Structures are given as structure tokens and as C-alpha cells.
Amino acid sequence: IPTLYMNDGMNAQSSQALHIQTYCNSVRQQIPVDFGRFPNLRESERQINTGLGAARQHAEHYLKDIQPLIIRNVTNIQDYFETQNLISTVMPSGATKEQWLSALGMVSDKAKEYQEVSANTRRTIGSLNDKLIIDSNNYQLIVVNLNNVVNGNNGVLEQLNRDIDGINAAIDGAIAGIVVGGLLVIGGAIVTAIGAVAGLVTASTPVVMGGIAMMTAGAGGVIGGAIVLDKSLSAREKLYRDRSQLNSEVLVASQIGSGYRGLQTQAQSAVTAATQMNNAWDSLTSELETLNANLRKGIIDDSFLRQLFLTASQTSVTKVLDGTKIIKQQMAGVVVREVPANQSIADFVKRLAALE
């Protein structure tokens, strides 16, 4: 069972990591707000842009310091299972009990080192989640204050925040399912695009923060997922259209707030995936330590270990090794499309849906 927990952990963390990576890129592409036209909104502009700087730093911390740890974890799984296959192919024909005890000791020590890497990753994303919880909650105070400065209706603003939170669940879900479905496609790719979360007006700063599309490309390059994803992206754009009675600068502040909270939502999902991955390494190290103790105590013998390691090599190891190779290629091979300045993310995906 540890090998299947390992495989499920790797698939879930790898697919989620691509989603939070794209989300982070959307945060880093958000232009600072400009309330230059309204002099007594200067303090609200500074607070929001201070917030956006902090959000950009959190996104950069994920991209630069955490994503490489998730890829490393996949390499560690590969190296663990290659070492397990080495044991399985060299030791059953002739290895002594002494050699089996050393093998279990040395492979348990390597698994424990990989487990500790997974645990450091979990703690690092846990700390980032915690800072994002604090910062995204404090950010919402700025939006309420700005709504008060312009004598806005706080019931309309709260109804918009509740609606966007609701639709963000659907968008997050649709994207999670698209990336899960594409992760293990041989020769396939993940295609990404960043754009405005609401309809664009030529004559209000556009907000691309959490304005993401993720789709699949097969071996032949043909896009999948745009039709699926188009329903929720258009829904978000429609919920913002239905509150164009709200103050324009409040709307922008609110959209950045939903983006900041959405970045925290992604970080929470990354904690969950990292916890599942650490728990899967724990089950593997626990098994290997138990085998080592059981052999030393004469509760199992070399014949038991021959059976276990020959069966392991022939049953679920090949699927995990194939996965590590496909996952590394997919994570290195993400395709970015540039969205034209006059297309929202929903307009861009709708044009792709029309072609699928």
C-alpha cells in the first residue's frame, strides 16, 4: 500500500503545484492600481499597492523557493524506486541475511532523508499559507475603508465578495480536474494563460490576479479543456457585470482582494498535497524499518524478502517510475500563451472553446 500512497501523493502534489504556479504568475503580472484621477483616494492606492507588493513577494517565494522542492520530491521518488528495483534485481539471487540487513538499513536511511525533504517542504508551504492567511485578511480592511471613503454600499460589496468566492470554488475545481486529467498524458502538455477576471473597457485598472486558464494539449498540440473551463470563467465575468453599479476603484480593490484570498486558497491546497506526500513517505519508511527490525529478530527470513521485493518490482513500481518521468517532462514543458490586451481571460478561453 505505501507504493500506491506514494504514487497518489506524487500525482496530487504535482498537479496542484502546476495550478498554484500559474496562480502565482497571475499575481506577478498584476499592474499596480492607479487612482491618480481622485486625489483623496491616494492613501487607498498606496495601501493596495503595498499589499500587491507583498502578494508578489509571496508568489515569488512559492515560484523560486517552493516549486523546485516539489520537482525535487518527484526526482526523490524516482531515485527511491530505482534503488528499490536495484535491490529487487540484484539481491534475491544470492544475497546473505547480513546483506539484506545492510540493504534494509541503507534504503530505510535514504527513504528517511527523502521523507525529511517532504517534511521541510510541508513546513515551508505551511509558513507561506500562514503569512497569506494574515496578509489576505488584513488586505480586506483596505477595501472596506475605500468603500467608506466613496460612500459606497457595504451590502452590495459583501454580496459581490460572497458571489466571487462561490464562483472561484467552481473555477478552482474545473482547473484542478483539467490539470489532473492532463498530468500523465504521454507527449501532452499543460497550456496556460493569464488575463482579466472581468470584461474590459478601453476608457479602472484591469485585474489579472487569479485570472488564469489551464488547458491540455495532446501530443499533436490540439487544445482540450477550453469548453469545460469557459463556463466558470464566463460565470465570474457575468457576476462582475451584474455589479457594475459599484464604485470603479472599489471594484478594482475588491478584485485584488479576491486574488489575494485566492492565492491563500491555492497555498492551503498545496499544504494538503504536501501533507499527503509526507504521510506517504512516512508509510514507506515505517514499512522499511519494520522489515529491518523483523529480519534482525528472525520474525521474517530472506525468503520473505525475496518474495516481497520480486513482487514489488513486477507489480506497482513500473507505473510509479513512468509517472516520475512523465511528471518531470510536464512540469518542465508548461506552454504559456499571451492574451491580447483587449481580451479578458474568459474572452480568450471562449475564442479557444470556439476552435476545440
Author numbering: 3 to 205, 208 to 360
From the publication, what sentences describe this entry?
Tripartite α-PFTs are members of the ClyA α-PFT family. Proteins in this family undergo a large scale conformational change from a compact soluble structure, where the hydrophobic residues are hidden often within a β-tongue motif, to an extended pore structure with the hydrophobic residues exposed in two extended α-helices which insert into the cell membrane. Here we show that S. marcescens has a tripartite haemolytic α-PFT (SmhABC), and propose a mechanism of pore assembly. We present the structures of the soluble A component (SmhA), as well as the soluble and pore conformations of the B component (SmhB).
As expected, soluble SmhB folds into the family observed β-tongue structure, with a five-helix bundle tail (α1, α2, α3, α6, α7), and a head domain containing three α-helices (α4, α5, α8) alongside a four-strand β-sheet (β1, β2, β3, β4), which includes the β-tongue motif (β1 and β2). The head domain of SmhB is largely hydrophobic. This is particularly evident in the β-tongue and helices α4 and α5, which together constitute the predicted hydrophobic transmembrane region (G175—L233). The crystal asymmetric unit contained two closely related monomeric AhlB molecules (RMSD Cα 0.56 Å) with the only significant differences in the tail domain, where α7 from chain A folds as a single helix with a kink at S320, while in chain B α7 is divided into α7a and α7b by a short loop region (T319-V321). AhlB and SmhB use both a short β-strand and a short helix connected by a loop, while SmhA uses only a short loop perpendicular to β1. The second region is between the N-terminus and β-tongue, which includes a family conserved glutamine (Q38 SmhA, Q32 SmhB, Q45 NheA) on the N-terminal helix α1 that forms hydrogen bonds with the β-sheet backbone of the β-tongue. In addition, both SmhA and SmhB contain a family conserved (conserved in all but 1 sequence) lysine residue at the C-terminus (K333 in both SmhA and SmhB) that forms a hydrogen bond with a conserved hydroxyl (T81 SmhA; T78 SmhB) on helix α2. As the overall structures of the soluble and pore forms of SmhB are almost identical to those of AhlB (RMSD Cα 0.64 Å and 0.46 Å, respectively),, not surprising given the high level of sequence identity (62%), we investigated if these structural similarities also conveyed functional similarities. The B and C components interact at a binding interface located around residues 95–123 of SmhB, this could break latches 1 and 2 on the B component, releasing the β-tongue, C-terminus, and N-terminus to initiate the transformation into the B component pore conformation.
